[PDB]
Amino acid sequence: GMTEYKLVVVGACGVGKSALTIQLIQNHFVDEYDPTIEDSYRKQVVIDGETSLLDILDTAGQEEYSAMRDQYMRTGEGFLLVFAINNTKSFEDIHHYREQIKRVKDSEDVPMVLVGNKSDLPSRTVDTKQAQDLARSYGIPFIETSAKTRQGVDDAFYTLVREIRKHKEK
Numbered sequence: 001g002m003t004e005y006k007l008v009v010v011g012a013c014g015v016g017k018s019a020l021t022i023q024l025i026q027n028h029f030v031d032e033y034d035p036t037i038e039d040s041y042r043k044q045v046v047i048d049g050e051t052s053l054l055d056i057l058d059t060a061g062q063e064e065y066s067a068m069r070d071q072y073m074r075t076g077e078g079f080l081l082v083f084a085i086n087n088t089k090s091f092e093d094i095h096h097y098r099e100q101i102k103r104v105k106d107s108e109d110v111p112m113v114l115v116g117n118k119s120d121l122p123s124r125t126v127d128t129k130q131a132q133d134l135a136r137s138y139g140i141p142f143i144e145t146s147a148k149t150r151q152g153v154d155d156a157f158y159t160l161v162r163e164i165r166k167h168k169e170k
């Protein structure tokens with residue numbers, strides 16, 4: 001079939017994984033999506049002239065969840081590491097998600113983007129510099145998003161696809 005990219009969205013409960021995914025797919029802001037629904041969503045997109053079918057796993061369950069997730073993690077070509085700028089714990093969790101990804105990818109080199117969500121909120125608790133510096137250490141892009149305003153949403157996913165393309169050239 002057509003060109004596909006397998007994307008997985010991860011990060012702490014409540015960071016906005018679902019809101020980001022729904023903004024990408026449906027172009028609206030959902031503020032009360034069941035925090036427990038884990039499903040895959042698709043979108044036909046054009047990125048730098050390339051038409052592809054994005055397959056996006058919006059994760060929600062505990063660390064050990066299902067065979068279907070294990071399968072999605074294995075096919076996963078790129079990962080959005082999401083935290084919320086007003087939640088220090090979600091940022092502190094980031095290495096945990098990166099560790100688990102590297103584990104499911106047989107330790108291999110994995111396209112990723114660090115995403116600081118909820119950029120619209122006034123009471124920032126996560127230091128922008130700390131996020132930039134962490135992303136730099138990982139060798140990955142850092143993008144600030146708001147699922148509310150849609151700022152950064154396309155950039156986050158499209159950047160991830162571009163990272164996958166680069167990886168595929170090796």
Ligand SMILES: *CCC(=O)N1CCN(c2ncnc3c(F)c(-c4ccccc4F)c(Cl)cc23)CC1
Pocket residue numbers: 010011012013014035036059060061062063073096097100101104
């Ligand atoms: C509100 C519920 C929610 O959004 N949750 C976020 C994800 N859940 C979670 N908690 C801890 N550790 C997790 C993981 F390690 C992983 C995971 C597993 C394997 C590879 C990569 C990866 F990110 C996932 Cl998908 C979710 C985790 C808690 C609930």
Ligand SMILES: Nc1nc2c(ncn2[C@@H]2O[C@H](COP(=O)(O)OP(=O)(O)O)[C@@H](O)[C@H]2O)c(=O)[nH]1
Pocket residue numbers: 011012013014015016017018019020030031032033034035117118119120121145146147148149
């Ligand atoms: N202000 C603001 N709220 C957000 C944003 N993204 C998500 N939320 C809210 O944060 C809560 C959790 O979002 P959700 O997408 O369900 O998080 P998930 O558990 O990671 O899937 C919901 O009340 C959303 O409306 C954002 O960018 N800005």
Ligand SMILES: [Mg+2]
Pocket residue numbers: 017018019033034035036037058059060
């Ligand atoms: Mg969710």
